[PDB]
Design an enzyme around this catalytic site. Structure first.
Site, short mmCIF file in Angstrom:
data_model
loop_
_atom_site.label_atom_id
_atom_site.label_comp_id
_atom_site.label_asym_id
_atom_site.label_seq_id
_atom_site.Cartn_x
_atom_site.Cartn_y
_atom_site.Cartn_z
CG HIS A 1 40.02 42.36 53.64
ND1 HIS A 1 40.49 43.06 52.55
CD2 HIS A 1 38.93 43.03 54.08
CE1 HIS A 1 39.68 44.09 52.32
NE2 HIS A 1 38.71 44.07 53.22
CB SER B 1 38.20 47.15 51.52
OG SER B 1 37.35 46.08 50.98
CD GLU C 1 43.85 42.00 51.07
OE1 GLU C 1 42.68 41.97 51.47
OE2 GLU C 1 44.61 42.96 51.22
#
Ligand SMILES: *[C@@H]1O[C@H](CO[C@H]2O[C@@H](C)[C@@H](O)[C@@H](O)[C@@H]2O)[C@@H](O[C@@H]2O[C@H](CO)[C@@H](O)[C@H](O)[C@H]2NC(C)=O)[C@H](O)[C@H]1NC(C)=O
Ligand SMILES: *[C@@H]1O[C@H](CO[C@H]2O[C@@H](C)[C@@H](O)[C@@H](O)[C@@H]2O)[C@@H](O[C@@H]2O[C@H](CO)[C@@H](O)[C@H](O)[C@H]2NC(C)=O)[C@H](O)[C@H]1NC(C)=O
Ligand SMILES: *[C@@H]1O[C@H](CO[C@H]2O[C@@H](C)[C@@H](O)[C@@H](O)[C@@H]2O)[C@@H](O[C@@H]2O[C@H](CO)[C@@H](O)[C@H](O)[C@H]2NC(C)=O)[C@H](O)[C@H]1NC(C)=O
Ligand SMILES: *[C@@H]1O[C@H](CO[C@H]2O[C@@H](C)[C@@H](O)[C@@H](O)[C@@H]2O)[C@@H](O[C@@H]2O[C@H](CO)[C@@H](O)[C@H](O)[C@H]2NC(C)=O)[C@H](O)[C@H]1NC(C)=O
Ligand SMILES: *[C@@H]1O[C@H](CO[C@H]2O[C@@H](C)[C@@H](O)[C@@H](O)[C@@H]2O)[C@@H](O)[C@H](O)[C@H]1NC(C)=O
Ligand SMILES: *[C@@H]1O[C@H](CO[C@H]2O[C@@H](C)[C@@H](O)[C@@H](O)[C@@H]2O)[C@@H](O)[C@H](O)[C@H]1NC(C)=O
Ligand SMILES: *[C@@H]1O[C@H](CO)[C@@H](O)[C@H](O)[C@H]1NC(C)=O
Ligand SMILES: *[C@@H]1O[C@H](CO)[C@@H](O)[C@H](O)[C@H]1NC(C)=O
Ligand SMILES: *[C@@H]1O[C@H](CO)[C@@H](O)[C@H](O)[C@H]1NC(C)=O
Ligand SMILES: *[C@@H]1O[C@H](CO)[C@@H](O)[C@H](O)[C@H]1NC(C)=O
Ligand SMILES: *[C@@H]1O[C@H](CO)[C@@H](O)[C@H](O)[C@H]1NC(C)=O
Ligand SMILES: *[C@@H]1O[C@H](CO)[C@@H](O)[C@H](O)[C@H]1NC(C)=O
Ligand SMILES: [Cl-]
Ligand SMILES: [Cl-]
Ligand SMILES: [Cl-]
Ligand SMILES: [Cl-]
Lengths: 524, 524
Positions: free
Chosen positions: A433, A195, A322
């Site tokens: 995610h 990320s 995600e």
């Protein structure tokens, strides 16, 4: 075990891992504590100690706000810091195989957390499995986050911006100067991050000052072209001044805003970060990277488009779902504790949560593109997660990969589609995610930990591919009749799917969706 | 001068043109008058006459409504029929060079008029200049228009649809059977047509029954993929039944609706055509081509996409300001008699005129795409004309050309950008729809007619290029150090601009606009 470094001796500790030994040096300092007059400044180099620095426990995590949305819940709590918070947080960790290797390839981890949170001491970032199983050295650092890491008034050395990126860079320099003493090869250094940690890796590819500090890069669910990754100079100014307002620090002289902010308790700066923007989202990055004329010489989109970046191999990927994690942080009708079947109107309201400053036409256009159904009660719930994942992670990673590969370099793209058997979040959130990370770090290699056998095998394969990428620039698993991972090129756009059942070569991931986000949406 | 044809003798008349002679045979019958029980049926073949048919004047034009918007005004009136209206209108004209040529290439003109109006006897369609100057034979036909040409109840031979397309086709057959007697080569036949006449030409490319009736095709400002060009079977049914309602012809039996409609005065059918749709536009085509299973075997978009059409060379083009003519037929704030500076709100209202059944989001999307200004008072006035021209003519002609050329055939595309010095419409309407036609037919070659010298030269060049295309498949002007006209291919998309000053090779005409209409807009 005591290693001599440029700045002094450090003692490590021995760990038993899979019938073998790893040496861990947890909490080595790599800069002057950025306290007092150093608050908001670039990290300053550390001077020598005598006697032995004991690197036998994780150091303080940087000051940050915590996720209090789900107290007692492992799914959220596993990401909260597990070490005391302190401005005195510029430390790094080293894990090395035993016996000491001779010229091991180095993997440097950069954590995510929106540039607002995170720490290197999380359990899912434990480098001991990689060191044990692949005989690489793993390094991880803490870097400043939030306003303390990224407050900017561009050009002013009291608060230039990108301080936490400079922290990362100085830790990269530490590895250059010191890793050979631990048996590491400074000429074989791969950055990896997830990320905001992946966005950071992608900025080190752009920064002339980082070019000689590493060899190759791995980007897990992030890149600097993501909509959350880079704060405009306009936003940064307004947020800095808003923060000054909220702390009684509004001043005529800008160097006096900073002096005032340096007198505030860290805890008072933290309390006011949330409000420096009128509307926020679950993906807000109030204080992040800026174009500062130092780390970042120009708008990174221009740098990428015109090929001004380090020429090397990249490994990039994203997870199937995600967007889902974020929906329980404010979208109406959503709960981790029910199946979150939402209606059209909830969907529309969710767009308002995720796209607050966007024209009504912008929002209708999203709805137009995502609600052409192929009736089904979970239609709208599924569409919102895809909206959020495509816009924020998947389409940007794919565009970064296309643009980067157009300059000649090999790039490899993955689509991670395995849901952890142990995932504490509900089934509707799917392949979330953040949840490839434990596979990359080899947690499922631990039989005591109750992952499935299919998960041990998947993790062992990912570990080997990541290690081969780092050592050799090519993320193959060569021994077990595995699918060969083709290079990603802008024409064919081949990618590899990572799952426990069947690993596949596929092409043009989210082609139709990303045409929307990449080519239409930036116009609204 | 008397020529013997398969069906009998015809006498022509001698014309003096540019110090030379052309023989004209105006008003030769090519079918049974479609009267009485033949109304709405496919044209029936004509039986022999004895004695000499005098083809010495233009015949009746087909029944049609007239443009009464601007009585006394040449700009509109020049398009109205100039011969009596009658259901007895299936006639054609032939112009031949004198002396009689030996094996002349044939140019067959198909007029436009929205499939609702038009006639071959207009002054701007006079084939005598082409015959004189290029020694080609020119043929033109009248075909039925409106409900009398295109009323459909699919499958029912009483009213199958496409009757006016079958009229055109039978006139093509007449040329096949008869043109050698006039000195023409039936194996060298080029179709040319403007607007609905160009859409018609493009349907003859698709129709298996027309394949052996011609060699090559020229499409001026039209193609069947234009949004106005083909009536859905759903629209056609509703319009046929609406027309039955409005004339007291609503019936249980469909063969009895038609019988009833055949008793109506032609003039009563005409009066009710306008209302068969709830909302109309200045570009409405109430009765047009349908997929009838006979002329047209499948939806023409499918035929085009999958390469099911006559394999030959095409010449295609559009005018710079296709959309302007239409704006004075109902858009608010527009007048041919002032400069039509409109506001945002007028623009928005104009979209409602031109896009009546389109979602509010559809309309906003048009406005989004066309109002990103590069302030300027004529911004909105200019945008509406471009909207209408791009959607209805330019983007469809360009898409037809791309798709057609992808199957191997040479295609040539032009962009006509000359405004007639004699244009009666205001300057703001620029290079209007319909106004290349007089250049193609060589009207500016006539010195008495008061066009400029630069216009004589432009027309002479276009005439030669059109003639070379017809005879040789290649629209070059080889003698006067002229710009070479490159083939249009789907990659480079080269086109030639036609103007009096500088003829240029350019690429990707309206690239940005047509991505909107061709790839986004059909989704709304
Ligand atoms: C730049 O910041 C201003 C400042 O407004 C803020 O004041 C801060 C101290 C903080 O508490 C913050 O929450 C507050 O909104 C923003 O102006 C505000 O905009 C909102 C919504 O448009 C209005 O309700 C307020 O009237 C307005 N406040 C003031 C005092 O002007 C502004 O939105 C921002 N600009 C950008 C680029 O987002
Ligand atoms: C899923 O739960 C949401 C979230 O809010 C709720 O969490 C539940 C687990 C429960 O404890 C409840 O008391 C709590 O409020 C539900 O949305 C809520 O539902 C109702 C009606 O729509 C409203 O009262 C709330 O405003 C709304 N909350 C939010 C944040 O929108 C949702 O209905 C539920 N869906 C199911 C059961 O399918
Ligand atoms: C199919 O036709 C119907 C019929 O409506 C029409 O009646 C005709 C005889 C004619 O006079 C025409 O002008 C008139 O509109 C259409 O239904 C009409 O739709 C409009 C607008 O939606 C409404 O105001 C009317 O209620 C309605 N009329 C009736 C009697 O039902 C219809 O729009 C059309 N469908 C298509 C595909 O356009
Ligand atoms: C251009 O003319 C239009 C068209 O309508 C007018 O035609 C003029 C030449 C004149 O004879 C006038 O009497 C006739 O009505 C003008 O639009 C009109 O203007 C006013 C105010 O906007 C309204 O009364 C009418 O509704 C409106 N007509 C239409 C069809 O919209 C227009 O203003 C004019 N523009 C100029 C002078 O720049
Ligand atoms: C350690 O090996 C060094 C070179 O190996 C690396 O070459 C780089 C260019 C890069 O491709 C890496 O991935 C390679 O592994 C060599 O120059 C050093 O001298 C070696 N040091 C030792 C053995 O002490
Ligand atoms: C007339 O010429 C005929 C062939 O000429 C044409 O060939 C076609 C295939 C096409 O390319 C045209 O453009 C060519 O001009 C020939 O077969 C006839 O016999 C000729 N008839 C005469 C002279 O009476
Ligand atoms: C570091 O650890 C060693 C060995 O356990 C200990 O003897 C020494 O006192 C330590 N130094 C400190 C606590 O500063
Ligand atoms: C702002 O104030 C600081 C006080 O330390 C001073 O150094 C600086 O000169 C001032 N800047 C200007 C240009 O007013
Ligand atoms: C390959 O499979 C073998 C068992 O056949 C296993 O022991 C080994 O760890 C695997 N290697 C990788 C890198 O996946
Ligand atoms: C056709 O024209 C000729 C010559 O002018 C004339 O003599 C003949 O009567 C005509 N036939 C008619 C009018 O039917
Ligand atoms: C409709 O009526 C006509 C009257 O001519 C007749 O020929 C036909 O059989 C009828 N069709 C049906 C199937 O009802
Ligand atoms: C070429 O130009 C000459 C004058 O030099 C002119 O007489 C002739 O008509 C032109 N030909 C064409 C086909 O434009
Ligand atoms: Cl808005
Ligand atoms: Cl495999
Ligand atoms: Cl609507
Ligand atoms: Cl030229």
């Amino acid at each position: 075990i005591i290693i001599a470094t440029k700045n002094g001796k450090v003692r490590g500790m021995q760990l038993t891992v899979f019938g073998g030994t790893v040496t861990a040096f947890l909490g080595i300092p790599y800069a002057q504590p950025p306290l007092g007059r150093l608050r908001f400044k670039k990290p300053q180099s550390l001077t020598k100690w005598s006697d032995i620095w004991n690197a036998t426990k994780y150091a303080n995590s940087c000051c940050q706000n915590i996720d209090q949305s789900f107290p007692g819940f492992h799914g959220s709590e596993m990401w909260n810091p597990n070490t005391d918070l302190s401005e005195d947080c510029l430390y790094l960790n080293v894990w090395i195989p035993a016996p000491k290797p001779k010229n091991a390839t180095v993997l440097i981890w950069i954590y995510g957390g929106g540039f607002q949170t995170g720490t290197s001491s999380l359990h899912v970032y434990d480098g001991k499995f990689l060191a044990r199983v692949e005989r690489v050295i793993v390094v991880s650092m803490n870097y400043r986050v939030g306003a303390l890491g990224f407050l900017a008034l561009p050009g002013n050395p009291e608060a230039p911006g990108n301080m936490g990126l400079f922290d990362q860079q100085l830790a990269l320099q530490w590895v250059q100067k010191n890793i050979a003493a631990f048996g590491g090869n400074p000429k074989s250094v791969t950055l990896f991050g997830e990320s905001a940690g992946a966005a950071s890796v992608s900025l080190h590819l752009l920064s002339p000052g980082s070019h000689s500090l590493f060899t190759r890069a791995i980007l897990q669910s992030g890149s600097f072209n993501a909509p959350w990754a880079v704060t405009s100079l306009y936003e940064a100014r307004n947020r800095t001044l808003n923060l000054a307002k909220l702390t009684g620090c509004s001043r005529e002289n800008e160097t006096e805003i900073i002096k005032c902010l340096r007198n505030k308790d860290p805890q008072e700066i933290l309390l006011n970060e949330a409000f420096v923007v009128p509307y926020g989202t679950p993906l807000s990055v109030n204080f992040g990277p800026t174009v500062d004329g130092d780390f970042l010489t120009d708008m990174p989109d221009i740098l990428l488009e015109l090929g001004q970046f380090k020429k090397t191999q990249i490994l990039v990927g994203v997870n199937k779902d995600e967007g889902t994690a974020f929906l329980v942080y404010g979208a109406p009708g959503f709960s981790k504790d029910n199946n979150s079947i939402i209606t059209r109107k909830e969907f529309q309201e969710g767009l308002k949560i995720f796209f607050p400053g966007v024209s009504e036409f912008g929002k209708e256009s999203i709805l137009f593109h995502y609600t052409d159904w192929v009736q089904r009660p979970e239609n709208y719930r599924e569409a919102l997660g895809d909206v959020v994942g495509d816009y924020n992670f998947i389409c940007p990673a794919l565009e970064f990969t296309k643009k980067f590969s157009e300059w000649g370099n090999n790039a490899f793209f993955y689509y991670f589609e395995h849901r952890s058997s142990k995932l504490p979040w509900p089934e509707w959130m799917g392949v979330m995610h953040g949840y490839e990370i434990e596979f990359v770090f080899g947690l499922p290699l631990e039989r005591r930990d109750q992952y499935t056998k299919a998960e041990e095998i998947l993790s062992r394969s990912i570990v080997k591919r990541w290690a081969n990428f780092a050592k050799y620039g090519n993320p193959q698993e060569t021994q077990n009749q595995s699918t060969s991972w083709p290079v990603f090129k802008s024409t064919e756009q081949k990618y590899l799917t990572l799952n426990t059942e069947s690993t596949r070569i596929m092409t043009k991931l989210r082609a139709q969706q990303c045409r929307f986000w990449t080519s239409f949406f930036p116009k609204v």
